[PDB]
């Protein structure tokens, strides 16, 4: 078993404030296949200056997906 290091020294893990309303926004960034968005390249070979059909694992054209945002925490002056 890979040794990963010491366990946590602190007992009291920090508090998190769940406020979904702040993160619930809209910023549409749909898949635009016309500029090859989210395309996994064929993982065995390569081609040059051609156009071919290919069966693989791609996302839907125009799909909006799920948006996620990360934010800073609460802080008073100089103390998170």
């Amino acid at each position: 078993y890979v040794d990963v290091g010491p366990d946590s020294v602190k007992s009291a893990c920090i508090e998190v404030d769940i406020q979904q309303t702040f993160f619930d926004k809209t910023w549409p960034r749909p898949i635009d296949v016309s500029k090859a968005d989210g395309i996994i390249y064929p993982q065995g070979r390569t081609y040059s200056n051609i156009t071919i059909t290919y069966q693989g694992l791609f996302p839907y054209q125009g799909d909006h997906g799920d948006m996620y945002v990360y934010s800073a925490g609460h802080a008073t002056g100089t103390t998170p």
Partner: protein, 96 residues
């Protein structure tokens, strides 16, 4: 499906290399992909990290060698033959 990654470790001595064989019809076994063809020096094309370069019809047409050169790959070609036959004199010639 079309990707193979475990292959027989065979030594390349020194005369068994892509270089010093350009223009000759040779057998090849490159990283588990084997066949017969003629190698040449072509200008680089395709994506380097995916050393094998194919065409629309799943034919290998290029290769990225460990020496840092892009080698341009073909198939060994046949010489067509026909026979010119005269029945009365029972004479024949060969057209290539």
């Amino acid at each position: 499906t079309d990707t193979n990654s475990v292959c027989p470790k065979l030594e390349f001595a020194n005369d068994t290399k892509i270089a010093s064989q350009l223009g000759n019809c040779v057998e090849y076994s490159l990283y588990g992909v084997s066949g017969r063809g003629v190698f040449q020096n072509c200008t680089a094309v395709g994506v380097r990290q995916q050393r094998f370069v194919y065409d629309a019809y799943q034919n290998l047409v290029g290769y990225y060698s460990d020496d840092g050169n892009y080698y341009c790959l073909r198939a060994c070609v046949s010489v067509p033959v026909s026979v010119i036959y005269d029945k009365e004199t029972k004479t024949h010639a060969t057209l290539f």
